[PDB]
Amino acid sequence: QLNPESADLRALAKHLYDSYIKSFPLTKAKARAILTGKTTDKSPFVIYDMNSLMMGEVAIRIFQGCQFRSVEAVQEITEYAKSIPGFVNLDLNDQVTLLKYGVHEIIYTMLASLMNKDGVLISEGQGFMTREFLKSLRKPFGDFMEPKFEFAVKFNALELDDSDLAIFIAVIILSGDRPGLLNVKPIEDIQDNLLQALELQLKLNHPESSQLFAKLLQKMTDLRQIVTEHVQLLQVIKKTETDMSLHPLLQEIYKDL
Amino acid sequence: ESADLRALAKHLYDSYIKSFPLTKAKARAILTSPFVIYDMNSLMMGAIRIFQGCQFRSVEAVQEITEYAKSIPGFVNLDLNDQVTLLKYGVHEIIYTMLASLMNKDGVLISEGQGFMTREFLKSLRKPFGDFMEPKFEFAVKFNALELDDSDLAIFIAVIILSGDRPGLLNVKPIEDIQDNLLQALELQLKLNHPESSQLFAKLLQKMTDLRQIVTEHVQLLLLQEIY
């Protein structure tokens, strides 16, 4: 049986899972059900070429649409972060820094829930845009999404569920090694609890899965490379597409990342 | 299983001690006596000439790490191409990991610890050289705060080598199988050696994220020429 210390972690796991469900309208559970045909009511329209894209309704237009759903996810992530115990008690400046650096890493984590090896759910699951079609977009927009797919397919082999992911994206937000943090110790103390709660969660939920905890934390290096690679591509786009406007919310996040 | 994990941890420590002349235990006592380089004048008595010497020492380290890799149980039984890929893509990560052992926030040991070059001097070198080592110092500061010792680093290092995500690997299965074993051994080791540092295993794994960022940044910024 468990002790009282484990007991507080289960309650923390429960609270975070609960807030996750309340902040993200499209869970992995819903996304996998749509992707695998648990559907007849949840079947998505598939976008795989020019006419199907138009029927669902070029490269810049898709990009602008990705950006603004991405801004929407910033709001959801920020809403979730407020529910992480201790986060809103932290110094305000550090709240911003943690969101600044953590938000994209979470966006790509959750994006993975929306993907299989052949495409990505869009518009809260009503559409599905193939990976082949995204890669066919004119340079360099065709290169935007492939590294997320390569990651998603490796990350999705961990077979995490929403109860696991809830704590994992909390651990991401609460990183003490973020640049420019005023007070690192309170951040680390919260992540230590989160790391304990994730570890027990993975042992109970995936008891046959050896060292899943460690393999999940190692995926954090993938996320950083995705973000670091996406920032580079964005810098190229701005220079060659001088007439393409980026969101100031995202502007402020990339600024000196 | 725990008996196995200790055997592996001891085996790796033994090998690490054999393979690496300047251990963390030694470097730290030295850092607390070496010839100090702080000045153009002081370097003389001790920018391109310094980068090349770092290149020399790194080639030296690549050989120590190679020898150490081959003591890792199962490593030599991997596909020969996979052994080459793992070392190729892993040595940069190991070198900066172990360079942290020779670093404090003020400088880095050099030449078996015979010398000490200061962070401030290295920062003063003309572009792009002055900005080569600053991100390694930032990294070593946060890494050394974990207070790992040589018995901890020997398993951590082996973990880095057995990374199943290096590009071009042919048989990823035994690599992840071995690393899984190493990860267990590291987790147990950090619990016994640091029973008071909560979640030190997790925090150490997270440091791989900074490590790889550092290596990529260093790559971008980057008969005699044949050797290097």
Ligand SMILES: O=C1O[C@H](c2cccc(O)c2)C(c2ccc(Br)cc2)=C1O
């Ligand atoms: O491949 C895509 O990446 C976009 C994306 C990236 C990151 C997060 C997200 O929610 C969507 C995205 C997307 C999502 C919705 C809309 Br409308 C347009 C593009 C893709 O099709």
Ligand SMILES: O=C1O[C@H](c2cccc(O)c2)C(c2ccc(Br)cc2)=C1O
């Ligand atoms: O033996 C070494 O040669 C390098 C070196 C140091 C000082 C002057 C020099 O010409 C070469 C050098 C070195 C240079 C940069 C960094 Br950083 C770490 C070591 C050694 O350890």
